[PDB]
Design a protein around this nucleic acid. Structure first.
Lengths: 182, 181, 180, 179
DNA sequence: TCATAAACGAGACGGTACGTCTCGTCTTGTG
DNA sequence: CACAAGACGAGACGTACCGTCTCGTTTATGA
């Protein structure tokens, strides 16, 4: 029997990406997506339960555009500093920013997509950090509070202030936090 | 003139509705109906839904903004303050205020500006000032404050209730310790 | 509170779409658009597409209902009344009206009752009364009226604007002759 | 495949009974049969065309042959009375309503239904009159008048319309055909 | 002491979007 | 190698709110 149209799925996904880019999450209608992709609304509803699941699936496929590798060296401070700065750079590009904003918005509005987006974004970042500190044998309570403050520094700053938030502050926060672990 | 009864009604309905349905679930018509008011009397005094919500949050600002204790141990102070903040953002009310502050700020530029003035800026200021009351270099105070507030706010926003005073305090201790040569 | 003019605009728009679509392709959204109005202005004041359409039909009763001529020649009068009726159901508008009236009525009984009370009944009453003048058994009058209105209405419902004045008039002539 | 074409018709029939016209859906018909709706669309554009075929295959429950004896008034009265009974039975009223709706839904369908129902009734009357050397105009007008009376009346009033009324209109019309 | 204008409750207005529904065509796997 | 099962583009359905705009109807002085 009939099966899902790949062409329509691709068109929907791409149209959503574009509309978030030019309008934001709050500015996104299922109707606009359908129009822009030349599909019927129901082709969207058939496969996704909401605006939120659609948006989540669209961000997740772009998750590599934010998660860079964690550098491994004898020098742990410079590793987490490079990691923090690189992530900051990523989160202050036009789409890095719009991606973070959208990600926050969708998470606030629906718990399921917060969880999925977080296994897509939050968790791998924090685990890069905890893994890196676990290499230097740091008590997990501490490695946790540390990963907390390093990622939180960046994500919170980029959400409060905009693209103006510079690498340097992130790298500084990485240095302080790391030196705190004696 | 202006009706105070109507105003308190509207603000109270906006609070209760924020609490029960979150920001995305708040409609003006709902606020009006629960307040027994005509919705025009909401548009007459507030330029938008976001500004109204902003006002409501600011009026509640003292539930979240706590004064930095200034004793002899900067560590115990910053940790006291962090755990206190994390405890205050962890009740249904504090949490709802956090989520709302975020949603509203993400959607409206000037509402973001007001809420940053009323919440983010003073909270960064608390930590920053407290470190510049010793003589930590300014960049280091910025970055440290960035990290403490960052830890608390992003954690609460990620794990809600199951965030603890303890992790926020420990985080405070690690940051402060990273400031001693 | 309730806007006149919005109402007027919706009734005219409805008339237009029925006239062109007709009842089966009548949508609220097309009406709203055509009338420069919000849907909810239609939904607020009308429990159904049928009650809307029925108000629109009942306002145009005058276009169809005509006074019964009363002369010395009852044959002449019923011929004229019927030919005048069949003329008015053979116009673009009158025909679209009949189809709509019948379509609307089939779908809901309250609608059929309101239209039968604003249309069928005054016409059969017109005929029956005209014959009650000339003094005729009730059954005969009734079944004569059934056939005078019936010939016209069912001809027009079946074939369309190809139906004629002549046929209606002649049917009248025949029926009345038959009451001799 | 014409084994499917038939299994669809009686399925539409069966359904059309319990749901009536407005509540008919190609989807439901495809479901009752062992068939994908595309099979139904292979032979019919729409619901109206299919309902129309069902009805046409059941024309004989409505139309009955014109009696031809030595008494025209009796023949026509009999005809009109029989059609009148047929149109106010219970299934007959429902059928008439479905026929009218189906016609209103689309012009092409109103034409097929007129051609298989209205037309042979009219022509049965015109022909029965042409057998008595009545004028074509007068035979047509009398036809319009008898069929018209019955059909219009059953559409306007319920199933309460009676044999005697149709019969009476017949006697009146025929009486009026005399010099 | 009234009359008088503001602010008010109510809620109708032209609109946008929602999420559901059914139509008639298009697609694909299996029987 | 035809066809049931059903995905698809289209677009109307009736509902919920949006922000604007009348409506009478309180009120609270200051003429």
């Amino acid at each position: 029997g009939s099966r899902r149209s790949e062409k329509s799925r691709v068109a929907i996904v791409e149209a959503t990406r574009a509309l978030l880019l030019e309008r934001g999450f709050d500015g996104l209608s299922i109707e606009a997506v359908a129009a822009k992709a030349g599909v019927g609304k129901q082709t969207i509803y058939r496969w996704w339960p909401s605006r939120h699941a659609l948006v989540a699936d669209v961000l997740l496929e772009d998750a590599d555009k934010i998660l860079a590798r964690m550098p491994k060296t004898d020098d742990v401070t410079a590793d987490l500093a490079s990691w923090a700065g690189t992530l900051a750079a990523a989160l202050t590009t036009r789409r890095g920013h719009a991606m973070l904003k959208t990600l926050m918005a969708a998470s606030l509005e629906h718990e399921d997509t917060a969880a999925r987006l977080r296994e897509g974004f939050s968790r791998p970042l924090i685990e890069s950090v905890r893994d890196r500190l676990r290499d230097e044998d740091i008590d997990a309570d501490h490695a946790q509070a540390a990963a907390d403050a390093l990622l939180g520094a960046v994500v919170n700053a980029v959400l409060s202030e905009g693209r103006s938030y510079s690498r340097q502050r992130a790298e500084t926060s990485a240095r302080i936090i790391v030196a705190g672990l004696r």
